[PDB]
Amino acid sequence: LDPRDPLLRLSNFFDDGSVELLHERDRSGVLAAAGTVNGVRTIAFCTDGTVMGGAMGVEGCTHIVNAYDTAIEDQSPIVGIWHSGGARLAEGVRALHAVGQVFEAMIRASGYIPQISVVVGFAAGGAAYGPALTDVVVMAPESKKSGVCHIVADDELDAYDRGRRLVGLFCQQGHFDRSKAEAGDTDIHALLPESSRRAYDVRPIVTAILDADTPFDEFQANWAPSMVVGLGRLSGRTVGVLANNPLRLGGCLNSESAEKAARFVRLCDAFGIPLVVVVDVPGYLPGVDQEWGGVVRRGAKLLHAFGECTVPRVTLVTRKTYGGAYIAMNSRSLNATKVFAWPDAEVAVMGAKAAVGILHKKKLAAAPEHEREALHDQLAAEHERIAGGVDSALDIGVVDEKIDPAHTRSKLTEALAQAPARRG
Amino acid sequence: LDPRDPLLRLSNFFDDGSVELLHERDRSGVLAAAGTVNGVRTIAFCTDGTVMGGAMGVEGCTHIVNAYDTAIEDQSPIVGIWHSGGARLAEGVRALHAVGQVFEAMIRASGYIPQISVVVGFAAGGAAYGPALTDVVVMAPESRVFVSGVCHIVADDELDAYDRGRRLVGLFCQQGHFDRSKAEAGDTDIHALLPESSRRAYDVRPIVTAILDADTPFDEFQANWAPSMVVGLGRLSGRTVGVLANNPLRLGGCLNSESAEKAARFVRLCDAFGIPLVVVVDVPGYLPGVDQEWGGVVRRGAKLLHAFGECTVPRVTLVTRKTYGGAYIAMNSRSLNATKVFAWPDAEVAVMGAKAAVGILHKKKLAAAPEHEREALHDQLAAEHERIAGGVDSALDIGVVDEKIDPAHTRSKLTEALAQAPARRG
Ligand SMILES: CC1(C)CC(=O)C(c2ccc(Oc3nc4ccc(Cl)cc4s3)cc2)=C(O)C1
Numbered sequence A: 001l002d003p004r005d006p007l008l009r010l011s012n013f014f015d016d017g018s019v020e021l022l023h024e025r026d027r028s029g030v031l032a033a034a035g036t037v038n039g040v041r042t043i044a045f046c047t048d049g050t051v052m053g054g055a056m057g058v059e060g061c062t063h064i065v066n067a068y069d070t071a072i073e074d075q076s077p078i079v080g081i082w083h084s085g086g087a088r089l090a091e092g093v094r095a096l097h098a099v100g101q102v103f104e105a106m107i108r109a110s111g112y113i114p115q116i117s118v119v120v121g122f123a124a125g126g127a128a129y130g131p132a133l134t135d136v137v138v139m140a141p142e143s144k145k146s147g148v149c150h151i152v153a154d155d156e157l158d159a160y161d162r163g164r165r166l167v168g169l170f171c172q173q174g175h176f177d178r179s180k181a182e183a184g185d186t187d188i189h190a191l192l193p194e195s196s197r198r199a200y201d202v203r204p205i206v207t208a209i210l211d212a213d214t215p216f217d218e219f220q221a222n223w224a225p226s227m228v229v230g231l232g233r234l235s236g237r238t239v240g241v242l243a244n245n246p247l248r249l250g251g252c253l254n255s256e257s258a259e260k261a262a263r264f265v266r267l268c269d270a271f272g273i274p275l276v277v278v279v280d281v282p283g284y285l286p287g288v289d290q291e292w293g294g295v296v297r298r299g300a301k302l303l304h305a306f307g308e309c310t311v312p313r314v315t316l317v318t319r320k321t322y323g324g325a326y327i328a329m330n331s332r333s334l335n336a337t338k339v340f341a342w343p344d345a346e347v348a349v350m351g352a353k354a355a356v357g358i359l360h361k362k363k364l365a366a367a368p369e370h371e372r373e374a375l376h377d378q379l380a381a382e383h384e385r386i387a388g389g390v391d392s393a394l395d396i397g398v399v400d401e402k403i404d405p406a407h408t409r410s411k412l413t414e415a416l417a418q419a420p421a422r423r424g
Numbered sequence B: 001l002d003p004r005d006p007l008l009r010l011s012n013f014f015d016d017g018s019v020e021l022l023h024e025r026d027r028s029g030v031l032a033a034a035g036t037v038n039g040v041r042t043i044a045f046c047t048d049g050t051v052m053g054g055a056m057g058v059e060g061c062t063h064i065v066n067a068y069d070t071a072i073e074d075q076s077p078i079v080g081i082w083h084s085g086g087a088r089l090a091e092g093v094r095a096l097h098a099v100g101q102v103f104e105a106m107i108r109a110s111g112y113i114p115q116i117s118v119v120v121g122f123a124a125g126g127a128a129y130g131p132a133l134t135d136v137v138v139m140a141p142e143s144r145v146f147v148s149g150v151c152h153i154v155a156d157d158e159l160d161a162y163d164r165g166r167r168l169v170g171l172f173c174q175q176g177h178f179d180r181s182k183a184e185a186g187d188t189d190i191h192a193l194l195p196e197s198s199r200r201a202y203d204v205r206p207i208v209t210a211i212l213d214a215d216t217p218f219d220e221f222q223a224n225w226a227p228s229m230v231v232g233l234g235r236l237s238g239r240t241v242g243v244l245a246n247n248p249l250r251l252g253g254c255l256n257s258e259s260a261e262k263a264a265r266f267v268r269l270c271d272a273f274g275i276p277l278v279v280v281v282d283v284p285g286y287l288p289g290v291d292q293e294w295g296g297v298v299r300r301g302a303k304l305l306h307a308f309g310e311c312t313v314p315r316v317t318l319v320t321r322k323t324y325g326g327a328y329i330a331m332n333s334r335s336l337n338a339t340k341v342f343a344w345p346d347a348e349v350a351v352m353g354a355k356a357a358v359g360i361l362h363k364k365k366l367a368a369a370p371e372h373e374r375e376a377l378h379d380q381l382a383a384e385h386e387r388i389a390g391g392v393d394s395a396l397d398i399g400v401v402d403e404k405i406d407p408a409h410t411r412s413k414l415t416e417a418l419a420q421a422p423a424r425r426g
């Protein structure tokens, strides 16, 4: 049997023996079926790469729309398996229109049922935009378009595995389990470098927070790498993680990372998935020709996403959080559910010696040049006695509690469990 | 620093004699007031450029938040006049937090009351992000916003900035009603504004202004950003409408990353405030970035599908010359539940131009033809292909065009469709 065969591909994706076709098999270029994924009733459709390379026509598009209507009616997740050059040119405008009706069904489903895309072959034209309307896109390598793909699998079978796990993440979200959170506690601070001025990969921190046995399904790892986002489980419960990555661009927010974070916040908010926000950000960067327009418009989008978000969202400041980027990374002013800080964390407008160079610029400029640097360091040292540090932030009220890093998991879980499912 | 005085700036913006302070003056760096704009009750606040460069502190940010809370309770438009270097560094984290609370209030108001920003001087730091959270940003030339597309409207000077800000309050809050008599009195032969050759480029803006009322400004948004797409507010027989139109003068009128984003953002803004849409379509395809990066047009194009697909205000489409392929679907097509789709009699609706199409469908037959005959053969196949496909008659049979119209009735045909539509759904 040809590897591209759509029944074979659906049967690989679904639970063995669960497949039930929604229509008679035909030459339309699409096969749609009901099935189960680890017990969850799921709808899926597959483009038929053996017929016209999978090109989309009126009758195949109608099968996809019918499957979307079936899935919306029963509130089931819907998975598309994509292998297709686009609309059938020979069918003309009728095919364009039917492709648009596929788009309109995905839009009607948006935020209502989870939509997973598994791209296992070449996907072009209308078949590139279809997956782009869904919530998570898994790409097998055998299938520039930066940002569009969320997860790169190893091969086709591995792509179905990741797709199946995503169905579980969205449809078997579970409950937080305080006792499982405690059993997984470790000293996560031990993963930071000894010098607070050295850069590190944030991913080990993220996996130490998340459940030891569950994978971290990172989204868009190679796009906007100063920001890490993805799905995992915290004490058995599906959570979303966003974390500045000091390893790239100093961990700074820029236009792409703000957009990556905002899109992920909106996805999690839409499906009731709470957020853990691991903050270690020193500032924000401009474009390339130094145009601030992108980070301003995309940064505003990030502000908008957190401000409107109603799922529980808890912030953990590990080391630094400065300036405008501090506000954007789920701050109390944007109604963060709770803000935690590790003991050595600094919450400030900017570095002390940068801040002193502005606040005392005239005094410093009026001092003899041979004794200016010694006065700058003295005023900086006095500035840190008052500004920064957790207790200043605690007194202000922008941090709710300083926590022992050995209790990060149970503190985060406790805060997420106490919040309502909605409002913030 | 008298000319930057907040009470005077507020008074120059509001109707003469309507200003009523919402708190007593101080040196917080913000003055907030209630007023009227051509009669409409309006809330406004002015950063005080005469106090510490307008730098934002806890006290001033608190006046702004109370101004927003007042405007939200009364469902009044709220106008910010911006001249500020950012948060007061000496207040430390407390000022950051208060600036954040200003952001949070703008977010609560989002889509609920119109928010207009008039940037009359420098606006930097948090005072750059404030305007970016609002619906329309008017910028006076003696000004800059720093820390494109952020600025919607560029005025001639500070006073012009207030005039344009005042007109925007009118467009959002005195939307009016459609008037069949005034629509027909304004009918002209819009098609005559096209070139004679269907291959020549042209500025779409005279077509737009000929649809809109002759006595009323077309307030184009972001004219110098994503120039293949034109968007803005004007009036159609007195009724506020939003316009989207591919501009063939730039990039052949193609869609691309930033034109998709320009269009999507503008669609969601009109839809939020009940403003019907006119979509003037003449689009031959879509484009990647110069690096051949498609991820922008895919991501932003999907967001434009979403914006039209979810849109519930009346939205009517006019095909002037041509609309092709995926760009066809995205430009308020029947498949995204456009209210009504109109076409001029010679318009083309097709997957692609006929020559391109038969060049693919009959690649082998053309490659086999003798070089000096492979062209006459191409034109023969292309004319056979457009006998059966691409015309308005065929689009009417299919059902993706609702009506072929006389271009001399464009303006009154669009008005009729928008006026008789449900205010919500589609
Ligand atoms: C022979 C073809 C390549 C012709 C053709 O054009 C398509 C096609 C159909 C639907 C598409 O879907 C969207 N295209 C855009 C473009 C811009 C924006 Cl802003 C949004 C969207 S959505 C995209 C391509 C085909 O499949 C076959």
Ligand SMILES: CC1(C)CC(=O)C(c2ccc(Oc3nc4ccc(Cl)cc4s3)cc2)=C(O)C1
Pocket: A253, A254, A258, A284, A295, A298, A299, A300, A302, A303, A323, A324, A325, A327, A328, A349, B085, B086, B087, B088, B089, B099, B124, B125, B126, B127, B129, B147
């Ligand atoms: C001297 C200053 C205190 C002046 C000042 O006011 C600010 C400032 C304050 C708030 C800001 O607001 C936002 N910044 C970002 C960045 C990224 C993203 Cl994604 C979203 C947002 S929102 C921006 C700058 C400073 O840093 C230094």
